Design an enzyme around this catalytic site. Structure first.
Site, PDB file in Angstrom:
ATOM      1  CB  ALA A   1      40.440  19.622  24.630  1.00 59.27           C
ATOM      2  CB  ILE A   2      37.488  15.571  27.778  1.00 60.72           C
ATOM      3  CG1 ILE A   2      36.301  16.334  27.150  1.00 60.72           C
ATOM      4  CG2 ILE A   2      37.074  14.787  29.036  1.00 60.72           C
ATOM      5  CD1 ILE A   2      35.358  15.463  26.360  1.00 60.72           C
TER       6      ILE A   2
ATOM      7  CG  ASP B   1      42.530  11.535  17.928  1.00 60.44           C
ATOM      8  OD1 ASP B   1      41.303  11.470  18.071  1.00 60.44           O
ATOM      9  OD2 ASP B   1      43.202  10.500  17.751  1.00 60.44           O
ATOM     10  CB  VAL B   2      42.844  17.482  21.222  1.00 55.59           C
ATOM     11  CG1 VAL B   2      43.143  16.659  22.472  1.00 55.59           C
ATOM     12  CG2 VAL B   2      43.260  18.914  21.512  1.00 55.59           C
TER      13      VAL B   2
ATOM     14  CG  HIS C   1      46.022   2.967  11.546  1.00 55.43           C
ATOM     15  ND1 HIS C   1      47.297   2.609  11.874  1.00 55.43           N
ATOM     16  CD2 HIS C   1      45.332   3.095  12.773  1.00 55.43           C
ATOM     17  CE1 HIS C   1      47.426   2.564  13.226  1.00 55.43           C
ATOM     18  NE2 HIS C   1      46.225   2.854  13.777  1.00 55.43           N
TER      19      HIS C   1
ATOM     20  CD  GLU D   1      41.408   3.232  14.829  1.00 52.14           C
ATOM     21  OE1 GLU D   1      42.032   2.205  15.219  1.00 52.14           O
ATOM     22  OE2 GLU D   1      41.891   4.387  14.848  1.00 52.14           O
TER      23      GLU D   1
ATOM     24  CG  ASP E   1      53.818   8.618  16.657  1.00 49.43           C
ATOM     25  OD1 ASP E   1      54.980   9.056  16.821  1.00 49.43           O
ATOM     26  OD2 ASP E   1      53.061   8.359  17.569  1.00 49.43           O
TER      27      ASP E   1
HETATM   28  O1  LIG Z   1      39.738  14.481  25.216  1.00 50.80           O
HETATM   29  C1  LIG Z   1      40.175  13.602  24.442  1.00 50.80           C
HETATM   30  C2  LIG Z   1      40.251  12.231  24.756  1.00 50.80           C
HETATM   31  C3  LIG Z   1      40.784  11.393  23.759  1.00 50.80           C
HETATM   32  N1  LIG Z   1      41.255  11.858  22.464  1.00 50.80           N
HETATM   33  C4  LIG Z   1      41.866  10.929  21.442  1.00 50.80           C
HETATM   34  O2  LIG Z   1      41.203   9.636  21.474  1.00 50.80           O
HETATM   35  C5  LIG Z   1      42.184   8.615  21.987  1.00 50.80           C
HETATM   36  C6  LIG Z   1      41.706   7.519  22.986  1.00 50.80           C
HETATM   37  O3  LIG Z   1      40.522   7.886  23.715  1.00 50.80           O
HETATM   38  P1  LIG Z   1      40.405   7.415  25.244  1.00 50.80           P
HETATM   39  O4  LIG Z   1      41.491   8.094  25.997  1.00 50.80           O
HETATM   40  O5  LIG Z   1      38.996   7.512  25.695  1.00 50.80           O
HETATM   41  O6  LIG Z   1      40.809   5.898  25.177  1.00 50.80           O
HETATM   42  P2  LIG Z   1      41.741   5.510  26.380  1.00 50.80           P
HETATM   43  O7  LIG Z   1      43.038   6.451  26.216  1.00 50.80           O
HETATM   44  O8  LIG Z   1      41.055   6.042  27.742  1.00 50.80           O
HETATM   45  O9  LIG Z   1      42.065   4.059  26.441  1.00 50.80           O
HETATM   46  C7  LIG Z   1      43.311   9.401  22.633  1.00 50.80           C
HETATM   47  O10 LIG Z   1      44.459   8.655  22.553  1.00 50.80           O
HETATM   48  C8  LIG Z   1      43.428  10.625  21.712  1.00 50.80           C
HETATM   49  O11 LIG Z   1      44.362  10.450  20.531  1.00 50.80           O
HETATM   50  C9  LIG Z   1      41.182  13.237  22.229  1.00 50.80           C
HETATM   51  O12 LIG Z   1      41.528  13.771  21.182  1.00 50.80           O
HETATM   52  N2  LIG Z   1      40.658  14.051  23.177  1.00 50.80           N
HETATM   53  O1  LIG Z   2      45.217  -1.568  15.493  1.00 43.49           O
HETATM   54  C1  LIG Z   2      44.552  -0.320  15.648  1.00 43.49           C
HETATM   55  C2  LIG Z   2      45.280   0.514  16.727  1.00 43.49           C
HETATM   56  O2  LIG Z   2      46.621   0.717  16.335  1.00 43.49           O
HETATM   57  C3  LIG Z   2      47.398   1.547  17.262  1.00 43.49           C
HETATM   58  O3  LIG Z   2      48.655   1.906  16.718  1.00 43.49           O
HETATM   59  C4  LIG Z   2      46.751   2.881  17.516  1.00 43.49           C
HETATM   60  O4  LIG Z   2      47.544   3.598  18.443  1.00 43.49           O
HETATM   61  C5  LIG Z   2      45.388   2.577  18.056  1.00 43.49           C
HETATM   62  O5  LIG Z   2      44.826   3.778  18.517  1.00 43.49           O
HETATM   63  C6  LIG Z   2      44.586   1.851  16.962  1.00 43.49           C
HETATM   64  O6  LIG Z   2      44.535   2.498  15.701  1.00 43.49           O
END
Ligand SMILES: O=c1ccn([C@@H]2O[C@H](COP(=O)(O)OP(=O)(O)O)[C@@H](O)[C@H]2O)c(=O)[nH]1
Ligand SMILES: OC[C@H]1O[C@@H](O)[C@H](O)[C@@H](O)[C@H]1O
Ligand SMILES: O=c1ccn([C@@H]2O[C@H](COP(=O)(O)OP(=O)(O)O)[C@@H](O)[C@H]2O)c(=O)[nH]1
Ligand SMILES: OC[C@H]1O[C@@H](O)[C@H](O)[C@@H](O)[C@H]1O
Lengths: 271, 271
Positions: free
Chosen positions: B59-60, B137-138, B159, B229, B252
Site C-alpha cells: 500500500a504505497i 493486491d490492496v 484471470h 504477472e 471485477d
Molecule cells: O501499492 C500498490 C501499488 C500497486 N498495486 C496493484 O498492482 C497494480 C499495478 O501496479 P503499478 O501501479 O506499479 O502499475 P501501474 O499502475 O503504475 O501502471 C495496481 O493496479 C494494483 O491492483 C497494489 O496493490 N499496491
Molecule cells: O492481459 C493481462 C491484463 O489484463 C487486464 O485486464 C488487467 O487489468 C491487467 O492488469 C492484466 O492482467
C-alpha cells in the site's frame, strides 16, 4: 526444477474432462479417472524428482501361483519408465518365478512365515530405498496403464461393488466394540484393502495404526467384518487420502462386466 | 492427527459437484469452485495443524486509501477461525488505518520506499511466523468466504478476462528476448498477478525466481508486457501450481458482471 517446454492440448476451464463422474473429493483430493490427467506432464514431474516406487505383494501358500502373471503384467503396465522395486513377501522363496525385468527395476524376496499391515510396518529399509509404497493383492493382473498419476502422500481405491451405494449400504464394520466401527451416518467411500499406498511415511503410519487397532480388537475377542479392509476404511475416514483411485484401478470383469463409465480396466481379478 | 466424527452429506462418485466447469487440472491439481469443497472438513484439517496464514499487501503512495476497506472486509471473510498475520508493506506507516481484529489475528506494518517479488523474498521472518503466504493486491475487497480451501504448496488464480480463451489469445509475454517469454503453442492458464500464494518455501522460491528473471530482463533493456504477472505466468507454466483458484477468487463486477458460472464473488475490485 523447471519442466521443459511441452506441447499438449490446452485445458479449458469451461469444458470438463469428465461430466459423468465426480473427479474431486469434498476435501479437494483428485479422483483419478481416465481423461482427468495428462500422463506426459505427470511423467515429467515425477522423473525430475527421480521417483522410486515400491510395490509390495504377499504370496503365501497357494498364492505363489499368481506371481508369474502378476509380475509379467506389472512389467508391461506398472510405472514403466520409472524406477520400481518389487517386494515379494513369501513363505516359499524358491516358488518365486524368474521374471525378466526392464531397466531400473528390481525385485526383492522377503521370507515370512490380517498381518500384512504388521509386516509392511521392514520400516528402515523402505525409507532408504523408495519414495512411495503401493500395496496390492497378488491374485491380480495389470491390463492397462497404472502410472505416476496415482502417487501422492496417501491414496485409497474406491471399491467396485460399492461406488454407487449410499453409505448405510457400505460393508463397514458396524459393531461399536470394534476399533474399525463406523456408524451409519459416517463415511465418504468404500475403499478396497487390495490397492492402497502413499509416501513411505504415510503408509507406515497407516499400517501401524491399522495393526494397533487389530491388536486391540484381538485382545477383546473381536475380528472386524472385513478384516484389514475394515480397519483401512476407518483409517481413511479419519485421515483423508490425498488422492482416491477410481474403480478403473481395481476391477473384476467376470463379476462386474465392463461398464461405459470405466474407459480403462487397469488392474483386475484373475479368471 | 485423526479427524473427529463428523456428519455431512455423502459424496457420490456418480454425481459430479459441478458439471459446468473443469474442477481438476491435467496435472491433477484441484480447481477451486463453489460446490467442490466441504469447508467443515477442510477447517477441521487445517485447525488440527494449527495453521497460520500470512497475507501480504502493498500500500504505497495513494494506495494507502484502499487499506481500510481491504482490512475490514478481510476481517469478515479471510480465514476466519484461523490464525492470520497481515503484513502491510507501506511508504506511509502513519496512514495505515486502525482496524479492529478478531482473536488470533495480528497486523505488522513494514516500511518500504515490479519489486513486490523482491520485497516478498523478509525471508527468515516469514518462515518462523506463518505456514502459508497469500499475496494479494490492496485495491480489492472481500465479499464472501476466502478460506483454507485455497491452501496448498503453490497456487495461482485464473484471470477473469481470460478463462474461456484459447491460449494464443492470452496476454503472455510474446517476445523471445524476455525471460517471461511463452510461445504461442504453450500455456495452461492465464494467472493473475494479484492473488497467488502457497507455503512460505514455495512462495519464496517463486518470488526469488521471478525477481531473478526481472533483473535479467532489466540488464537487457526489456520489461515484460504485464510486468510481474508475466513472470508469474512463466513460473507457473514451468512449476505447476498444486491448486488453481477459479475466478470467484478475483473478479471485477463492474467490468465483467456476475455470470451464472460464478456462484460466489469472493474477492473483487473496488468501484
Ligand atoms: O501499492 C500498490 C501499488 C500497486 N498495486 C496493484 O498492482 C497494480 C499495478 O501496479 P503499478 O501501479 O506499479 O502499475 P501501474 O499502475 O503504475 O501502471 C495496481 O493496479 C494494483 O491492483 C497494489 O496493490 N499496491
Ligand atoms: O492481459 C493481462 C491484463 O489484463 C487486464 O485486464 C488487467 O487489468 C491487467 O492488469 C492484466 O492482467
Ligand atoms: O498370500 C496372500 C493371501 C491373500 N491375498 C489377498 O487377500 C485376500 C483374503 O485374504 P485371506 O485369504 O487371508 O482371507 P481368506 O481368503 O483366508 O478368507 C485374498 O483374497 C487375496 O485377494 C494375497 O494377495 N496374498
Ligand atoms: O463388502 C466388502 C467385501 O466385498 C466383496 O466383494 C469383496 O470380495 C470382499 O473382499 C470385500 O471387499
Amino acid at each position: 526444477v523447471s519442466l521443459p517446454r511441452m506441447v499438449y492440448p490446452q485445458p479449458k476451464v469451461l469444458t470438463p474432462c469428465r461430466k459423468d463422474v465426480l473427479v474431486v473429493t469434498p476435501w479437494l483430493a483428485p479422483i483419478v479417472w481416465e481423461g482427468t490427467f495428462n500422463i506426459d506432464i505427470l511423467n515429467e514431474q515425477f522423473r525430475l524428482q527421480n521417483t522410486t516406487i515400491g510395490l509390495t505383494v504377499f504370496a503365501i501358500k497357494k498364492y505363489v501361483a499368481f506371481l508369474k502373471l502378476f509380475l509379467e503384467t506389472a512389467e508391461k503396465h506398472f510405472m514403466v519408465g520409472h524406477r520400481v522395486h518389487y517386494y515379494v513377501f513369501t513363505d516359499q522363496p524358491a516358488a518365486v518365478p524368474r521374471v525378466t525385468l526392464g531397466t531400473g527395476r528390481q525385485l526383492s524376496v522377503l521370507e515370512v512365515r490380517m498381518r500384512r499391515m504388521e509386516m509392511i510396518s521392514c520400516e528402515r529399509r523402505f525409507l532408504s530405498e523408495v519414495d512411495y509404497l503401493v500395496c496390492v493383492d497378488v491374485d491380480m493382473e495389470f491390463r492397462d496403464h497404472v502410472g505416476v498419476e496415482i502417487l501422492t502422500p496417501l491414496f485409497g481405491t474406491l471399491h467396485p461393488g460399492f461406488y454407487g451405494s449410499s453409505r448405510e449400504a457400505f460393508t463397514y464394520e458396524r459393531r461399536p466394540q470394534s476399533q474399525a466401527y463406523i456408524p451409519k451416518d459416517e463415511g465418504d467411500f468404500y475403499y478396497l484393502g487390495g490397492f492402497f499406498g502413499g509416501s513411505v511415511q504415510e503408509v507406515q503410519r497407516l499400517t501401524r495404526a491399522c495393526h494397533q487397532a487389530m491388536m486391540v480388537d484381538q485382545a477383546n475377542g473381536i475380528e472386524a467384518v472385513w478384516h484389514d479392509e475394515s480397519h483401512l476404511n476407518k483409517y481413511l475416514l479419519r485421515h483423508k487420502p490425498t488422492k482416491v483411485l477410481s474403480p478403473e484401478y481395481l476391477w473384476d470383469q467376470q463379476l462386474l462386466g465392463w461398464p461405459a463409465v470405466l474407459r480403462k480396466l487397469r488392474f483386475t481379478a484373475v479368471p
